[PDB]
Amino acid sequence: NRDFRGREQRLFNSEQYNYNNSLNGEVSVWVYAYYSDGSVLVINKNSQYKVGISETFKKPRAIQIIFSPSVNVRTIKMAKGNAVSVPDEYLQRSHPWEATGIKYRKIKRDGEIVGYSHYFELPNSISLAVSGVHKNPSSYNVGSAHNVMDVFQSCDLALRFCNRYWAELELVNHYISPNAYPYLDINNHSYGVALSNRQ
Distance of CA 13 to the CA centre of its chain: 21
- Dist. CA 40–CA 58, nearest whole Å: 12
Q: How many residues sit close enough to a copy of itself to count as binding (CB under 8 A)? A: 65
Closest by alpha carbon to 43, among 151, 159, 124, 125?
A: 159
H, E, C per residue of 32-99:
EEECCCCCEEEEEEEEECEEEEEEEEECCCEEEEEECCCECHHHCEEEEECCCCCCCCCHHHCCCCEC
Q: DSSP assignment, residue 104?
A: P
**Among positions 63, 133, 171, 184, the unique one binding a copy of itself when judged by CB under 8 A:** 133
58 binds a copy of itself (CB under 8 A): no
52 binds a copy of itself (CB under 8 A): yes
Nearer to a copy of itself, 52 or 60 (CB): 52
Among 3, 95, 124, 139, binds a copy of itself (CB under 8 A): 95
CB 175 within 8 A of CB 163: yes
Minimum distance of a copy of itself from residue 126's CB (angstroms): 10
- Residue 61 or 174 having the CB closest to a copy of itself: 174
List residues bridging with 131 in a β-sheet: 52, 77
- Least Cβ distance, residue 188 to a copy of itself (angstroms): 24
195 near a copy of itself (CB under 8 A):
yes
For residue 11, state whether it binds a copy of itself (rule: CB under 8 A).
Answer: no
Q: Cα–Cα distances in Å, from 7 out to 19, 71, 194?
A: 18, 28, 17
* Span near a copy of itself by CB under 8 A; candidates 1-9, 58-66, 105-113, 179-187: 179-187
Note whether 179 binds a copy of itself by CB under 8 A: yes
Which residues in this chain contact a copy of itself in the complex, by CB under 8 A?
15-17, 19-20, 24-26, 28, 44, 46-54, 56, 68, 75, 77, 79, 81, 84-87, 90-97, 127, 129-131, 133, 141-145, 148-149, 151-161, 175, 179-181, 195
